[PDB]
Enzyme design. Structure first.
Site, PDB file in Angstrom:
ATOM      1  N   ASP A   1      24.283  -0.913 -15.663  1.00 53.54           N
ATOM      2  CA  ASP A   1      24.421   0.401 -15.046  1.00 53.54           C
ATOM      3  C   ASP A   1      23.366   1.272 -15.690  1.00 53.54           C
ATOM      4  OD1 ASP A   1      25.070   2.884 -14.108  1.00 53.54           O
ATOM      5  OD2 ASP A   1      27.041   2.990 -15.121  1.00 53.54           O
TER       6      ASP A   1
ATOM      7  N   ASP B   1      30.369  -3.181 -13.741  1.00 50.69           N
ATOM      8  CA  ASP B   1      29.011  -3.568 -13.356  1.00 50.69           C
ATOM      9  C   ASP B   1      28.296  -4.372 -14.451  1.00 50.69           C
ATOM     10  OD1 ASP B   1      29.765  -1.906 -11.202  1.00 50.69           O
ATOM     11  OD2 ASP B   1      28.369  -0.291 -11.785  1.00 50.69           O
TER      12      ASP B   1
ATOM     13  N   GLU C   1      34.570  -2.176 -18.481  1.00 56.60           N
ATOM     14  CA  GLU C   1      33.717  -1.467 -17.531  1.00 56.60           C
ATOM     15  C   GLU C   1      32.429  -2.267 -17.325  1.00 56.60           C
ATOM     16  OE1 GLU C   1      33.714   2.766 -18.284  1.00 56.60           O
ATOM     17  OE2 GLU C   1      35.864   2.926 -17.662  1.00 56.60           O
TER      18      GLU C   1
END
Ligand SMILES: [Ca+2]
Lengths: 555, 555, 555
Positions: B284, B281, B248
């Site tokens: 974040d 990302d 992630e």
């Protein structure tokens, strides 16, 4: 009974003082090994640590010229506080003055000779190029010296050397992986590189880092890599490091063939580091040889796949500072590179020497470099690159004709500084995305927005928009002037609005009979002088494109 | 007698090899505890360290799926060198090629499946969104996996984990304060976050940091925080950290409600860190949920006090680098924020996604992002913010119609780069404080200072000041041209000075009878064409403001 | 027999619990020394470590007001985890609110008084200046307090203190060299400086660093140096450090005479550090006293050699961040300085106060400072300096008349931000090296390129180049306007091209009979009004320079 309890409850460590040789201690060690007395080693003395995961704590010196070789340390082994010192006190040069000015004259450099383990470095063949004529002038006893006391970690994985120091000291990781040189405590260097990760044999080096710390002096580069590839994970390189007074460069990735194979490097990090006062370069991150290059790359990509200087080196390069180089601040080659946040100040040679292609440079500052005119320019870029943000010029002047930036195939935006515009050469320079603009002028009776067409002239502005004071300060009155160059005289021809607060436009006219071809556009007129009647005439290109000549003003 | 002396003079440490369970060793330990043999733990195995201040030195592995839970460590306890490894070798995907190009096609991603503890990650539900269609194509044995070997520090104060590593490894600080994850030695992640400070129960987390080090892989975020508040002292966050290939995001502050309370975070530092190749990302740093948000914030400020995306998060954010995201480089929300020195390169989605209001962004560089057109723009700002220094465009082109910056309520100054001006949308763009200006043109026969009124047209310049060469290079002659758009044809109407080196002004006139309303100002005249007499006329607005029509030029 | 084996194979460490005084333990120690119980020391208690290289591991507190003095530690000694705590709980002030707004009113500050070892600081005489009137309002029991628990390392070489913490805590290195304060674990300060390297006696300090870590509170400065000189090698200073809520300044190099000699400092590094919410200044890197200076410099360069504020301090200053100062963000003096990459945000006094000469500042950002109008400007520079890149203005407005930058002898390039141009004062402002330019206008029916001659007026533009919409959006039509100021009315006189899409030039004429001196250049004409015949006339300066008056337009 007590012995059973004691063997379970106390930390295991032995001390070198209790053993006749380092191998004897190594063989007996279990967990800790304390270096508590100075140990004189012979060059090539090799210690086999039996694959054991040892914590080696140093509180004394390893003394010897040559290499102390550690082998077969287990992953997770750590060596802290090590201090290497040579037995020989060599002859060193100190090519800087008591006011920290570089010496460039060979005879002056020779005059600095002293016997010391620090405060200078042993001359090498590169000094013969750096200080022309010094080869002839150096006494034979100061030439060809080879003094270093080197801790060599050989073919180990997962070994870290922490807080190392020394005098005439070097640290070599040969054929290692996942090893680190951490928080170097300012070792003073010898003849060889101070920190080296060399992987010419075996698998490409990976996981090898210099993290933190600093070094001083040494005859060659402070931190250097041969045949390392960090992988796409960028697992290796230099982060948080300071180099002072390298005899060659602060941080070096080797170029070309060494022995029978490639010494080049890929996929490393070079970040958050500082190089000050190198005799050669701050960062030398090239992979191909510039002068008289090899025609091939044994062990690497062939020239047919990637031309010279166009390797996909893919390093991660960010937040670097260089000050005071006698050579080049920041040098590299490669294709497809991204480089950011580089600051270079006060270098005698070029601030940046970029043999790069299809690469991007963001937020670069090159401040008072090429100060000794050693190179052609302050920043050179060979290939077709992009520069986005470039600060040029501190407080130094340039007396001669050298360019500031020569990047003839590059497109550049965002120059700041008091650059002499005649000393810019680029493929394209533009500010496409500015907002509404104001030009604020201080210390002059005018403000100016100038235009310069470098194809016409690099030295003369071709036109301008000026505002000039009428009267004096506080008058509330200025005139605006639109100008064009003629006969290589800037501002030769001009139109004015409000000269002497007259509230009118002063319009230039052709000083003789206008030729037909002088008028450009339809539905326009061009005034011209008819001296034989003291009349202004108008050459008119009518709306339909046909020409007519009219009388415009008469006695 | 000796036993009395020995008990006083030796360092206390016991080793796990001498005990049948980790609890037995913990209970007997006094000062040091050495992990000298691999230890297989069961998930949920819980060790009570009796409040003792212990120095746990790891030279072997903790092996197990699930959590090894350490409790009741005294303040000042340290755990060094820990290595976590799962017992299960799961199925992992590797959505990048051998040339480090991201794979986006679901079928191509499925084809990468292998059983390994590293070099990829276990799919999770977020992959179903990231690689559309992959949910249907993944074999059942590659879906829903849950392998992590996690060291959990539970409800401790002042515990530091140093030089941790592992395979399928995670590190969880649950309900801790004043704890640090220091110099992470590149653990390879599992299903859960690699480094987590979670404080959903008890007091808000404070004093919790990731300092230094790096991580690789993992299915979700590398470093993450839930319900931490650093206080005005900014005592917590991430400094000096590197994340590679997060499944992630590199660094994540959680958003929204988790369980029954807030997972949000305040007053943390995010500085001097790097995120490379995250699947989602880089950073974040949002606190509120973007898509389908909660209507309330249990445990936090209510929506009535601070609207969605307008929390006073107050993080200290500076000197961050992101490269290679498949998602967004840098994302955040909040109101009243200051952000500085952010560099983002080569991201497939937006370089920056800023759901911020009344916030200031200083020295931002967004270089070659939204390269896969995943978002509407390269940098988006929703609220009324200020941007002071924004570098745009590296070397990539944009074929489609996407905007570069869309910050419709923001005021911006200091754009640099080869931005396509039609792809800028801001509330206000200005350079209020420039000095005297020169426009230097390379590779053209002209130099240009252009004006573009975006309300009129985002794609066409509305007027220009040009300088154009007369003759060729070295002529010493150019003409200056002032132009205006008409009929959507740039430069349609113009006045020239020195065309063809004529030394006169070429003046455009109205191509037919001028209407009264064509003239603007008093004491001005407007030439116009009277075709029926081959005459120029002048529409004059006299000094008193009244109109008169005069004859200006005649046959 | 076992005793022989045991003495060789176990690590030596003794613990303070086994000894009645710290000196007794020191005298018996060999390698390790464990502080395992809290130890109450008396002020001035002095421990002689016999020149031994000791590793002092702290797992309990040293408790006492005053100084615990360590002497005669061998090079390589390390002290880890030390925790200093006072016996006295003093009265402290907390001059900030629960929303982190600074309190400036003396009575409000007095109202914050509480007895605590943290969460505020003991007032000192500098508070009497900072909060005017507070001297009268403070109760006597809150004035003149002097509580600090200080670990003093005295006249040692090569000693490092790692991970130190405490309450009312200080760390003093007096007469030391090659010592470091590493990874300070957020000690909460007392009356004296939190970290001090003081070398007023003996050789100038060298090799002394603060590396990493952070501090909070304290009555005076967080990290400070007296009489240190890093040499050309720049061997000392502050790298990677964070200061929060210093009662004076974050990082301070002392100025002027202390006792009988100089307290000044040379050749130090100040890099990669952050100062937040100091009551006085972020970085105070001056060497000479500003207000009421000494007429001499005993122990330093005389005033005859270097004038006040012109010492060749030669610090290496780069990559610093300051936020939230109640005083000045970044202050310094000296001559010949290079400073780079400084970011200052949200300070109540000047962002930067630069008493410097012949110095260069590169990439400076001063964002929303002087917010309480404590100083004359946001950035002040006294001497003749160069600024290359200066970001000004975040989101705050300025209601009064204060300048933004006052650098009257400095040459500046590369300002970005929504600065009010009337609030810039410099010697010279220029953008010499821009490319082709476009001015993009948003939120207006016009785009503008304005000129302002500050000698004429700092508040009014003296001329402009505009483009204005004809009709409305999408018309494909604009007019270009060239203007000049008259009677202090901007844009009073203008020439237009394409007003109302007429495709002609509107030309201003002199509203009465033109005087001879109104025309400037040869081969030009100036139209003027003859009201007595309703005629335009032309004042002509012929090609030969002589004047003639012609009729230009008639009824
Ligand atoms: Ca006429």
């Amino acid at each position: 009974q007590y012995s059973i309890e004691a063997d379970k409850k106390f930390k295991y460590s032995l001390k070198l003082s209790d053993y006749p040789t380092l191998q004897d201690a190594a063989s007996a060690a279990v967990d800790g090994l304390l270096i508590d007395r100075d140990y004189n080693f012979y060059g090539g003395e090799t210690v086999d640590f039996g694959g054991k995961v040892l914590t080696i704590e140093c509180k004394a010196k390893f003394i010897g010229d040559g290499n102390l070789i550690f082998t077969k340390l287990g992953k997770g082994s750590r060596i802290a506080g090590v201090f290497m010192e040579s037995t020989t006190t060599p002859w060193v040069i100190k090519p800087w003055t008591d006011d920290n000015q570089w010496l460039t004259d060979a005879a002056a450099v020779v005059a600095t000779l002293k016997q010391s383990k620090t405060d200078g470095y042993q001359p090498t063949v590169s000094d013969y190029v750096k200080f022309p004529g010094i080869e002839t002038l150096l006494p034979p006893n100061a030439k060809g010296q080879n003094i270093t006391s080197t801790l060599e970690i050989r073919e180990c994985i997962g070994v870290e050397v922490h807080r190392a120091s020394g005098l005439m000291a070097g640290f070599l990781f040969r054929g290692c992986h996942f090893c680190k040189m951490v928080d170097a405590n300012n070792p003073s260097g010898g003849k060889d590189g101070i920190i080296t990760f060399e992987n010419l044999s075996g698998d490409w080096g990976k996981g090898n880092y210099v993290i933190g710390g600093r070094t001083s002096y040494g005859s060659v580069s402070s931190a250097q890599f041969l045949r390392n590839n960090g992988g796409f994970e960028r697992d290796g390189g230099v982060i948080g490091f300071t180099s002072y007074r390298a005899g060659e460069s602060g941080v070096k990735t080797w170029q070309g063939t060494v022995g029978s194979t490639t010494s080049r490097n890929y996929n490393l990090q070079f970040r958050d580091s500082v190089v000050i006062y190198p005799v050669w370069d701050g960062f030398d991150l090239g992979a191909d040889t510039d002068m008289n290059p090899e025609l091939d790359r044994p062990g690497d990509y062939p020239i047919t796949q990637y031309p010279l200087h166009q390797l996909p080196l893919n390093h991660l390069i960010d937040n670097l500072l260089v000050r005071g180089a006698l050579g080049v601040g920041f040098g590299m080659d490669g294709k497809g590179m991204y480089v950011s946040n580089i600051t270079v100040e006060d270098c005698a040679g070029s601030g940046a020497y970029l043999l790069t292609h299809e690469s991007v440079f963001t937020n670069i500052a090159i401040i008072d470099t090429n100060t000794k005119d050693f190179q052609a320019n302050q920043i050179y870029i060979s290939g077709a690159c992009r520069v986005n943000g470039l600060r040029l010029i501190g407080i130094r002047s340039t007396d001669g004709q050298s360019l500031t930036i020569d990047a003839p195939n590059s497109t550049v935006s965002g120059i700041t500084g008091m650059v002499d515009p005649s000393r810019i050469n680029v493929a394209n320079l533009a500010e496409e995305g500015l907002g509404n603009i104001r030009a604020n002028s201080f210390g002059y009776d005018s403000a100016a927005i100038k235009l310069r067409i470098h194809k016409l002239s690099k030295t003369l502005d071709s036109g301008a928009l000026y505002s000039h004071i009428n009267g004096g300060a506080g008058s509330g009155s200025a005139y605006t002037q639109l100008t064009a160059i003629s006969g290589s005289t800037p501002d030769a021809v001009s139109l004015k609005v409000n000269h002497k607060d007259c509230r009118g436009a002063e319009i230039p006219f052709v000083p003789d009979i206008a030729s037909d071809d002088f008028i450009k556009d339809s539905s326009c007129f061009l005034p011209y002088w008819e001296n034989n009647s003291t009349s202004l005439k108008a050459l008119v290109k009518k709306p339909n494109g046909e020409l007519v000549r009219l009388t415009l003003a008469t006695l």
